[PDB]
Design an enzyme around this catalytic site. Structure first.
Site, PDB file in Angstrom:
ATOM      1  N   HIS A  40      -9.208  15.792  -2.561  1.00 56.85           N
ATOM      2  CA  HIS A  40      -8.391  16.741  -3.359  1.00 56.85           C
ATOM      3  C   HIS A  40      -8.848  18.196  -3.219  1.00 56.85           C
ATOM      4  O   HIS A  40      -8.263  19.069  -3.829  1.00 56.85           O
ATOM      5  CB  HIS A  40      -8.355  16.343  -4.862  1.00 56.85           C
ATOM      6  CG  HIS A  40      -9.526  16.664  -5.767  1.00 56.85           C
ATOM      7  ND1 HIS A  40     -10.509  15.868  -6.105  1.00 56.85           N
ATOM      8  CD2 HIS A  40      -9.770  17.867  -6.439  1.00 56.85           C
ATOM      9  CE1 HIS A  40     -11.323  16.483  -6.925  1.00 56.85           C
ATOM     10  NE2 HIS A  40     -10.886  17.692  -7.134  1.00 56.85           N
ATOM     11  N   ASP A  84     -10.855   9.340  -2.816  1.00 55.89           N
ATOM     12  CA  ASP A  84     -10.974  10.835  -2.851  1.00 55.89           C
ATOM     13  C   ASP A  84     -12.203  11.264  -1.989  1.00 55.89           C
ATOM     14  O   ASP A  84     -13.253  11.595  -2.506  1.00 55.89           O
ATOM     15  CB  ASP A  84     -11.167  11.276  -4.277  1.00 55.89           C
ATOM     16  CG  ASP A  84     -10.991  12.802  -4.461  1.00 55.89           C
ATOM     17  OD1 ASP A  84     -10.570  13.446  -3.519  1.00 55.89           O
ATOM     18  OD2 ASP A  84     -11.288  13.227  -5.566  1.00 55.89           O
ATOM     19  N   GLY A 175     -14.816  22.898 -10.000  1.00 55.01           N
ATOM     20  CA  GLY A 175     -15.627  23.811  -9.149  1.00 55.01           C
ATOM     21  C   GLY A 175     -16.744  23.035  -8.508  1.00 55.01           C
ATOM     22  O   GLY A 175     -17.276  23.426  -7.487  1.00 55.01           O
ATOM     23  N   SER A 177     -16.257  19.771  -7.782  1.00 52.04           N
ATOM     24  CA  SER A 177     -15.534  18.739  -6.963  1.00 52.04           C
ATOM     25  C   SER A 177     -15.950  18.787  -5.509  1.00 52.04           C
ATOM     26  O   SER A 177     -16.081  19.884  -5.002  1.00 52.04           O
ATOM     27  CB  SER A 177     -14.022  18.968  -6.994  1.00 52.04           C
ATOM     28  OG  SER A 177     -13.571  18.762  -8.337  1.00 52.04           O
ATOM     29  N   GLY A 178     -16.139  17.624  -4.933  1.00 53.08           N
ATOM     30  CA  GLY A 178     -16.539  17.517  -3.516  1.00 53.08           C
ATOM     31  C   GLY A 178     -18.054  17.522  -3.306  1.00 53.08           C
ATOM     32  O   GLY A 178     -18.520  17.108  -2.262  1.00 53.08           O
TER      33      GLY A 178
HETATM   34  N1  LIG Z   1     -15.256  16.404 -15.980  1.00 55.60           N
HETATM   35  C1  LIG Z   1     -15.638  16.211 -14.743  1.00 55.60           C
HETATM   36  N2  LIG Z   1     -16.684  15.466 -14.450  1.00 55.60           N
HETATM   37  C2  LIG Z   1     -14.915  16.806 -13.709  1.00 55.60           C
HETATM   38  C3  LIG Z   1     -15.387  16.744 -12.360  1.00 55.60           C
HETATM   39  C4  LIG Z   1     -14.701  17.333 -11.296  1.00 55.60           C
HETATM   40  C5  LIG Z   1     -13.541  17.990 -11.609  1.00 55.60           C
HETATM   41  N3  LIG Z   1     -12.716  18.622 -10.856  1.00 55.60           N
HETATM   42  C6  LIG Z   1     -11.785  19.062 -11.639  1.00 55.60           C
HETATM   43  C7  LIG Z   1     -10.712  19.847 -11.151  1.00 55.60           C
HETATM   44  C8  LIG Z   1      -9.726  20.368 -12.014  1.00 55.60           C
HETATM   45  C9  LIG Z   1      -8.653  21.147 -11.558  1.00 55.60           C
HETATM   46  C10 LIG Z   1      -7.594  21.630 -12.625  1.00 55.60           C
HETATM   47  C11 LIG Z   1      -6.698  22.912 -12.145  1.00 55.60           C
HETATM   48  C12 LIG Z   1      -6.886  24.282 -12.944  1.00 55.60           C
HETATM   49  O1  LIG Z   1      -7.202  24.310 -14.119  1.00 55.60           O
HETATM   50  O2  LIG Z   1      -6.714  25.337 -12.352  1.00 55.60           O
HETATM   51  C13 LIG Z   1      -6.767  20.331 -12.979  1.00 55.60           C
HETATM   52  O3  LIG Z   1      -6.870  19.873 -14.102  1.00 55.60           O
HETATM   53  O4  LIG Z   1      -6.067  19.801 -12.137  1.00 55.60           O
HETATM   54  C14 LIG Z   1      -8.573  21.413 -10.178  1.00 55.60           C
HETATM   55  C15 LIG Z   1      -9.524  20.922  -9.272  1.00 55.60           C
HETATM   56 BR1  LIG Z   1      -9.389  21.326  -7.339  1.00 55.60          BR
HETATM   57  C16 LIG Z   1     -10.578  20.143  -9.773  1.00 55.60           C
HETATM   58  O5  LIG Z   1     -11.497  19.647  -8.880  1.00 55.60           O
HETATM   59  N4  LIG Z   1     -11.926  18.756 -12.919  1.00 55.60           N
HETATM   60  C17 LIG Z   1     -13.054  18.077 -12.856  1.00 55.60           C
HETATM   61  C18 LIG Z   1     -13.696  17.504 -13.947  1.00 55.60           C
END
Ligand SMILES: NC(=[NH2+])c1ccc2[nH]c(-c3cc([C@@H](CC(=O)[O-])C(=O)[O-])cc(Br)c3[O-])nc2c1
Ligand SMILES: [Ca+2]
Ligand SMILES: [Cl-]
Length: 223
Positions: A40, A84, A175, A177-178
Site C-alpha cells: 500500500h 501487503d 508514516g 508503513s512499510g
Molecule cells: N495504528 C497502526 N499500527 C498503524 C500502522 C501503519 C499505518 N499506516 C497507516 C496509514 C494511514 C493512512 C490514512 C490516510 C490519511 O490520513 O491521509 C488512512 O487512514 O488511510 C495512509 C497510509 Br499510506 C497509511 O500507511 N495507518 C497506520 C496505522
C-alpha cells in the site's frame, strides 16, 4: 511511532525512507539492491534514502538511489490489505558499511511473546499529527493469534500478526508503513495497518514475512 524513543543515529542500518519530495513510508534493505516495503506504499517516482537519521538534514552517510522497479505482490488486496508486501529494486547497488546494512530474512516464524524492534519516521501522536525529524524506535512483543483475532474479528488473515500493547500508548502509526519489525535479528514483519494509533485494545497489524520468504527469493532471482 507513538510512545517510542529516539533510536540514535544509524543504530538501525537497514531502515530506509521512501521519498517522493517528502517521506511517505519506510522499508528494509535486504541485500545491496533490494528493499522490502508494504504494497500500500506503492507509487511511481520513488527515491529510496538509506543511512538516514534526520530526514530533513543531510548529515552525512546518506545514499539516495532511485527505485528501478517496484513489485507489488500479485495477490495484494487493497481492501483487506492481505499480502501487503512489495519489493523495490534499486537503480544501482547501495555501498554497505556499518551505517547501511541489510537485515536477514527469517527461516521460521516467530512465536507470541517474541520482543521485536519497530522503527520509523511516522506520526508520534495518537490524537493529532506530529512527524519527527529523526528515527524513532519501539520495542513491542508479538501477541497471540487469539488476542489479535479478538481485537480485529474477521479482519486477520494467516498473513498477518499483531504486535504491541493492548493498554494503548505505544504503537506504530501512519508514516511508519512499510518499515521493519525485527526480532532476534530477522525481519519478521512489515508495518501495515491498525485502527487509529496506540488506542486501547487496537494493536498494530503487520505483514507476516516468514510466509513470503520463498516468494521474495524467487522474485529477486528472476528480476
Ligand atoms: N495504528 C497502526 N499500527 C498503524 C500502522 C501503519 C499505518 N499506516 C497507516 C496509514 C494511514 C493512512 C490514512 C490516510 C490519511 O490520513 O491521509 C488512512 O487512514 O488511510 C495512509 C497510509 Br499510506 C497509511 O500507511 N495507518 C497506520 C496505522
Ligand atoms: Ca538526513
Ligand atoms: Cl475471526
Amino acid at each position: 511511532i507513538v510512545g517510542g524513543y529516539t533510536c540514535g543515529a544509524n543504530t538501525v542500518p537497514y531502515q530506509v525512507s521512501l521519498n517522493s519530495g517528502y517521506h511517505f513510508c519506510g522499508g528494509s534493505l535486504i541485500n545491496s539492491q533490494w528493499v522490502v516495503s508494504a504494497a500500500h506504499c506503492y507509487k511511481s517516482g520513488i527515491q529510496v534514502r538509506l543511512g538516514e537519521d534526520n530526514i530533513n538534514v543531510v548529515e552525512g552517510n546518506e545514499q539516495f538511489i532511485s527505485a528501478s522497479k517496484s513489485i507489488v505482490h500479485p495477490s495484494y488486496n487493497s481492501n483487506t490489505l492481505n499480502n501487503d508486501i512489495m519489493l523495490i529494486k534499486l537503480k544501482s547497488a547501495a555501498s554497505l558499511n556499518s551505517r547501511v546494512a541489510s537485515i536477514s530474512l527469517p527461516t521460521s516464524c516467530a512465536s507470541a511473546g517474541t520482543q521485536c524492534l519497530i522503527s520509523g519516521w511516522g506520526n508520534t501522536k495518537s490524537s493529532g499529527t506530529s512527524y519527527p525529524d529523526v528515527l524513532k524506535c519501539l520495542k513491542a512483543p508479538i501477541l497471540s493469534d487469539s488476542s489479535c483475532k479478538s481485537a480485529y474479528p474477521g479482519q486477520i488473515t494467516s498473513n498477518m500478526f499483531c504486535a504491541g500493547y493492548l493498554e494503548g500508548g505505544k504503537d506504530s502509526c501512519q508514516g511508519d508503513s512499510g518499515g521493519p519489525v525485527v526480532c532476534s535479528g530477522k525481519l519478521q514483519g512489515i508495518v501495515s495497518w491498525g485502527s487509529g494509533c496506540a488506542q486501547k485494545n487496537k494493536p498494530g497489524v503487520y505483514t507476516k514475512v516468514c510466509n513470503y520468504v520463498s516468494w521474495i527469493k524467487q522474485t529477486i532471482a528472476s528480476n
